[PDB]
Amino acid sequence: MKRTYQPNNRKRAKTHGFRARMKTKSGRNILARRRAKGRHQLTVSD
Amino acid sequence: EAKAIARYVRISPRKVRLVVDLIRGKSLEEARNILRYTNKRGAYFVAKVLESAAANAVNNHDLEDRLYVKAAYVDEGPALKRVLPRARGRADIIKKRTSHITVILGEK
Amino acid sequence: AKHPVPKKKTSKSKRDMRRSHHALTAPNLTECPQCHGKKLSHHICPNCGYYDGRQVLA
Amino acid sequence: SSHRLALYRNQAKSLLTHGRITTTVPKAKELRGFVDHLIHLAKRGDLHARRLVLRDLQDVKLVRKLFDEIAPRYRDRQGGYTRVLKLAERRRGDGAPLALVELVE
RNA sequence: GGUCAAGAUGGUAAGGGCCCACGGUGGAUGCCUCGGCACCCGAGCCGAUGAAGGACGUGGCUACCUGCGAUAAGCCAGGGG
RNA sequence: ACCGUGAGGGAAAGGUGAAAAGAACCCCGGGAGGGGAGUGAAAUAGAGCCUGAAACCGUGGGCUUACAAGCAGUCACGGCC
RNA sequence: GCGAAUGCCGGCAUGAGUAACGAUAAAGAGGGUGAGAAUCCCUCUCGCCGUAAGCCCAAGGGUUCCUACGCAAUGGUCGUC
RNA sequence: GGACCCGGUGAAAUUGAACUGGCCGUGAAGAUGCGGCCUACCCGUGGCAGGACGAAAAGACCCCGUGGAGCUUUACUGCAG
RNA sequence: CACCCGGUGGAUGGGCCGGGGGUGUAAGCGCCGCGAGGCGUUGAGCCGACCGGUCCCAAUCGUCCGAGGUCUUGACC
């Protein structure tokens, strides 16, 4: 059926992961956004 | 005269309903074979709620036999809101409508 | 695909009325062969074994 | 079809072994005649007869067991070598008035 | 006392509609608070002597909440009790 | 918590009592749950257990129901209660 | 100050004890356990695979794996599995 | 193989409300509910589609808002090059 | 569902049994040919509801409900 979910450790991870977000302006942005703003955890945390 | 009961009773209130609506107001011992040898579920149950009934009395509510069921009833309540196939999109849950079960046992 | 579905709140009244023709009818049972008690009209049981032959237990 | 048989089969089988089992109304009502019929063959008793009876049942032990064993205990009567008796109770959820049947003895 | 002939009213309800009493189911409601909201006076920087923020972590006996963190419900010193 | 791969969305849910004194024991029962005793000012205050309304499902009773039309109904006259 | 916005939120009735059991690869019998077993355990007939309804390496999911206890709900019926 | 009878389970959009018959007439001009009339007991289950202007969806065909969005050239202007 | 006939003083199911119908002479042994087979026994064997016997079998035993006889007038015994 091929949905769109097949997760890929390697993938998903990579792609998304503390770092990256960081590395980025943007990413970083929202991130520290989320942080306070909300609490929670985060991607990679995932 | 005394009485038996029990809520949080999983079952078709309705169905149940037929149950008594039979053995209903009638000689103890007597129906005590109705539900003993009748059919549809509930029975079993129904029976039960007749024994702690006949009991309770004689025991703490007192004259055996000469007894019966001046009256018997059942009520529904607590549901069991149950989830089923997402309209293949949106949820469709039914409800195993819990079931109460009171029933009298007074002496002739 | 709901071509046809009710069209007017069924009326408790009626509704039930419907559910009306329904009703039970206690097992026609009888009384023991010599088993003494009430059995399923035509059969031995956790009281019998008999009939005419001891084909059971207890 | 292939199922009607099968049944009659294993039921006919098992039975002869005990000579009175527990299947529902019908089920029994039939396993009778047949099984029954079969009997009448153990009675015939011979090359043929056996070559049939077995033909279905499939199994020396029995097959023979009955032809010799029981057969006799019956050599006299006129069919009926079975007494299909209904039962008092009923398998649950279901509510099927099962029943029991045996080789009239 | 019987028979025919006619003539008119009644009981019987499978469930049902209204009224009454007693439950059940459901939580409105009032009242209530360890919480907000709002405005005014106080205050106003943290950071490599690796911050803010998490990770995995000890309680004798365990997920969570906690305070610490490895010297983990805490180790020193002074003031209050 | 939960749907979202993600950025993000983003809920619901409080209340026994003066304090537990939170129901030893005996009963039908596989139990849950129901019958007694005991706390008690009251437990139809009893463990999601203050107030706990309606809708909606029950159990009995009064009246009423089989040549009859309209959600309604409301005006008249009659019998049962 | 509310019927009333195909209004929002929550409960609650409908159709309705009719529609569905997720492939027409079928079962049935004897014993055993259990409060209670069409739906569990042993056993004996029988049917369906067999290029799979085979074992294997991966990726994904992470204790789901075993063993002793237990069935309240999840198992679209049971259920001691 | 469902459907039907049994046992077990047990939804779903739409719906003001309703005890909702035919006629020929009517009204906003294609009426079970308004008039006259004729047949007309009370309920149900297995069905058959006609009417309830049946359900689905605030017509996509239409026009109307000096609504919007895409492509076009000797439309207006302006920028990129 | 209602509807019809029967409920062991029964033939109602099945069973058996004769009968029909239907399949084309069986399982075995036999005798011919290296074999394949054939020919025989043998219209055999086997038979699902069709026509009819016989209490082998199974419809045992048992329950429940059910009337009483409404009011007036008159016509006759």
Swiss-Prot record, chain B:
Keyword RNA-binding: yes
Gene Ontology terms for molecular function: rRNA binding; structural constituent of ribosome
PROSITE patterns registered for this protein in UniProt: RIBOSOMAL_L22 (PS00464)
One of the record's GO cellular component terms: cytosolic large ribosomal subunit
Ribonucleoprotein in keyword set: yes
GO biological process: translation
Origin: domain of life: Bacteria
Keyword vocabulary terms for this entry: Ribonucleoprotein, Ribosomal protein, RNA-binding, rRNA-binding
InterPro entries in the cross-refs: Ribosomal_uL22, Ribosomal_uL22_bac/chlpt-type, Ribosomal_uL22_bac/org-type, Ribosomal_uL22_CS, Ribosomal_uL22_sf
Stated role: This protein binds specifically to 23S rRNA; its binding is stimulated by other ribosomal proteins, e.g. L4, L17, and L20. It is important during the early stages of 50S assembly. It makes multiple contacts with different domains of the 23S rRNA in the assembled 50S subunit and ribosome. The globular domain of the protein is one of the proteins that surrounds the polypeptide exit tunnel on the outside of the subunit, while an extended beta-hairpin is found that penetrates into the center of the 70S ribosome. This extension seems to form part of the wall of the exit tunnel. Deleting residues 82 to 84 (the equivalent deletion in E.coli renders cells resistant to erythromycin) would probably cause the tip of the hairpin to penetrate into the tunnel.
Subunit structure: Part of the 50S ribosomal subunit.
PANTHER family: CHLOROPLAST 50S RIBOSOMAL PROTEIN L22-RELATED, LARGE RIBOSOMAL SUBUNIT PROTEIN UL22M
Membership in a protein family: Belongs to the universal ribosomal protein uL22 family.
Name of the featured protein: Large ribosomal subunit protein uL22
From Swiss-Prot, chain D:
GO CC annotation terms, alphabetical: cytosolic large ribosomal subunit
GO biological process terms on file: translation
Cysteine pairings via disulfide bonds: none
InterPro entries named in the record: Ribosomal_bL17 (IPR000456), Ribosomal_bL17_sf (IPR036373)
Keyword set includes Amino-acid biosynthesis: no
Gene3D superfamilies reported for this sequence: Ribosomal protein L17
PANTHER family, per database record: LARGE RIBOSOMAL SUBUNIT PROTEIN BL17M, RIBOSOMAL PROTEIN L17
Family of the protein in this entry: Belongs to the bacterial ribosomal protein bL17 family.
Name of the protein in question: Large ribosomal subunit protein bL17
Organism of origin: Thermus thermophilus (strain ATCC 27634 / DSM 579 / HB8)
